[PDB]
Design a protein around this ligand. Structure first.
Ligand code: NUP
Ligand code: NUP
Lengths: 215, 215
């Protein structure tokens, strides 16, 4: 990932999403697109971003249904041009395997979400997160998501998945996480509001990158 | 819900989804639409179904992100015309409250998913499900989803949420659940493939209803 920085593009308007992404494209070549933008503007937005910006697209679709439904969601998402899809591990191994099978068929990637960054993640997810990570390892998952807001958890996750696995981390900036600290454990950070709600998104991205280079 | 039967419309083609829903509309006035259809045909499909069939629409969007993102997803979903949205409880109380707040603002409903119907639900969700249900009760949730495939779990869920709460249940037919047994505890059953992959969906729906009337 260019500059170890992934833009979370959660603006809900195509014009604003295209403006901001264009402004920060010199700094960022991977964009995470989720349901706020896709449900507002359509799945065609993924191929539009890929063509216009030449970026990789990670679909943050928190996939979390039964295996048969997960299959259909993954196939629609890869058909739309996404490079990778973020999948919850909490629904269990069969739900994750369904996504892995479609990614294998379509030459794409799954990122396994093992612990979330928000306060409510402490209630149920955190207690299962180590086991979710170990399940990922046993399924052959190579790409993971864990929380910038809890670097001790992010260290434990890294310990389980090993150094070869790729780990990306949201919760930097708005949610309280720090770029440098998070990059002690994660390969890349995800940043949304700190960039896309800034008066100058390019300056916000550049400031983050400057602090990343220093590491 | 008419005949206590909710159609899970997970066909991915607008023409096929419209045909099947039209064929079974005399039996069913509530349709659950999820991401397989929405990601393939667009969010406009929700208002199209509402207008053409005059049905209620439950969006099975398994909402499972951080509170801020859940807010945006719920607002886009209700803007598109959905009557209700299914929300995972596993991400914790703040993630659920975010959905409840948007539903309150927009005069809509949240259904809390507490335990899932597939085999993988045993790994992590089942152990948290009673607590997820109790969290729902303490947040004032009145609508719940629980699994036809485990009627003893569905009985325990009903026990926690009480008799006034509304409980709907997937996993009937294809996944192995039984209509009559499930309706001992749930107010309505959700049925997808047993109807929409049948040679005669209307006959399949009618057969299910005939077994429901007998109760
Ligand atoms: N996928 C996620 C998993 C997670 O644990 N936390 C999280 O924030 N996200 C997403 O990352 C982004 C964080 O954006 P921000 O807090 O930097 O605005 C948003 O798109 C969230 O939905
Ligand atoms: N929302 C769900 C929660 C759940 O626990 N199980 C489940 O099957 N569903 C959904 O219900 C429907 C079951 O359809 P079928 O098994 O009758 O085809 C599908 O849309 C699933 O995604």
């Amino acid at each position: 990932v260019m500059n170890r920085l992934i833009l979370a593009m959660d603006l809900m308007n195509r014009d604003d999403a295209l403006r901001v992404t264009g402004e920060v494209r010199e700094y960022i070549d991977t964009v995470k697109i989720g349901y706020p933008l896709v449900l507002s503007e359509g799945m065609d937005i993924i191929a539009e971003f890929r063509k216009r910006f030449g970026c990789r697209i990670i679909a943050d679709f928190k996939v979390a249904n039964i295996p048969e439904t997960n299959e259909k969601i993954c196939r629609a998402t890869f058909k739309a041009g996404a490079d990778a899809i973020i999948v919850h591990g909490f629904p269990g191994a069969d739900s994750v395997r369904a996504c892995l099978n479609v990614a294998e068929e379509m030459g794409r990637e799954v990122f396994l979400l093992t612990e979330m960054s928000h306060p409510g993640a402490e209630m149920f997810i955190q207690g299962a997160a180590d086991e979710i990570a170990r399940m990922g390892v046993d399924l052959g998952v190579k790409n993971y998501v864990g929380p910038s807001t809890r670097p001790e958890r992010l260290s434990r996750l890294r310990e389980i998945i090993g150094q070869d696995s790729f780990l990306i981390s949201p919760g930097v900036g708005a949610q309280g996480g720090d770029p440098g600290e998070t990059l002690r454990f994660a390969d890349a950070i995800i940043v949304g509001r700190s960039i896309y709600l800034a008066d100058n998104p390019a300056a916000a991205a550049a400031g983050i990158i400057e602090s990343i280079k220093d590491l």
